Every structure is written in structure tokens, then in C-alpha cells.
DNA sequence: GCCTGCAGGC
DNA sequence: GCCTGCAGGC
């Protein structure tokens, strides 16, 4: 993708905030800022805890097009994302 | 504490005990279960459900004797039951 | 228990 | 692409 956010449900429980640095919990929602790597080709996620990702600021028009993996989220979760975007 | 085990096999790397070729994941898989000297913990013997039989492995009531039957597909259920009365 | 293949994190 | 955890094999 090419894409400059993702949102998933956790993986694993290993990932860090980027803002807070605790853990985000094995199938939690989360957002990524897609980053490219100057180790290597490719694009990495800074996964943030969801309500951590907001605070850091975001004007995401529209999050079903701009966001990454927004269409595989369970359906009251895709409301929560758009309610959170637009406010 | 059952001495058998079925399952549709977690991974395509275990390898048959009686025949030697891999048992493809998702594929109907037996084992003899054995306690390890070496760890607490049983190792399986895996087979092929065919050969499983072909090695002198019997059983007589599935249900009871080989963990995880109840959980497999009716129609392995079946099979199962059916070949350890053949 | 140890190994290994690979998924997840970065 | 490098590191590590971990599931799955034995
Ligand atoms: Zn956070
Ligand atoms: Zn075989």
C-alpha cells in the first residue's frame, strides 16, 4: 500500500505506542503512520494506541479511502474511526 | 492421559512415522502419544491416517481412547470409528 | 527441553 | 533487511 495510515486490530501484544511507549494489547485497535525505512525498502508502521493516535493531530478527510485496512474492521469500529476523523 | 490423538494437522512439516513423506497441513493426522524423559510434556508420533493402522496400532473405542475425536468432522468421525472396528 | 521457519516489530 | 517470539515438530 501506499498509503499513509493503517488500522488493524493487534497482531500481537508486543507493539509499542509511539507516544505513550506502553504496550498496545493483542487485538486492540490500532493506528499506524506508514514510514518509509532507511535501512531497507520498504514502508513500517509507528503503531500508536487509538486514542494516542489522535492526540498527536490529524486532519484525515476521508478515513475509508485514506486509511489502510479501514474496510476489514468490524463495522461499529469503521463508525468509531469516522466519528473520531470528522470530530 | 489418552494414548491417541487426531487432529487436522496443524503444519505441513511433521513426517509420517511408518511411510516418511509429509503430512500436509489440514490433513487428517494420527499419533501415538509418548511421555518424554526429557521434559514434562507428551511427544506425538504422527502418521498418516492410513498408516497409522499398517503399524499395529489399535483401537477399539475412538470416542474413548483417542483425544480429539469428538471434535473432528462427522464424517471423520465416522471413518475413524469404522476403521478401528475394521 | 532445543530447533527452525516464519510472523510480527522496527 | 536484522531480531525476537512463538507455534509447531520432536
Ligand atoms: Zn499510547
Ligand atoms: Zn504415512
Same mark, same amino acid.
Given at each position: /500500500? +501506499? $498509503?499513509l495510515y493503517?488500522? #488493524?486490530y493487534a497482531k500481537s501484544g508486543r507493539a509499542s505506542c509511539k507516544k505513550c511507549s506502553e504496550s498496545i494489547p493483542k +487485538? /486492540?485497535?490500532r493506528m *499506524?503512520?506508514?514510514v518509509? /525505512?532507511?535501512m531497507? +525498502?520498504?514502508?513500517v508502521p509507528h503503531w500508536y494506541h487509538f486514542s494516542c493516535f489522535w $492526540?498527536?493531530?490529524?486532519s484525515i478527510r476521508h478515513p475509508d479511502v485514506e486509511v489502510d485496512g479501514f474496510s476489514e474492521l468490524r463495522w461499529d469500529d469503521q463508525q468509531k474511526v $469516522? $466519528?473520531? *476523523? #470528522? *470530530?
Open positions: /500500500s +501506499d $498509503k493503517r488500522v #488493524e +487485538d /486492540s485497535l *499506524a503512520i506508514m518509509q /525505512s532507511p531497507f +525498502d520498504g514502508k $492526540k498527536v493531530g490529524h $469516522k $466519528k473520531t *476523523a #470528522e *470530530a
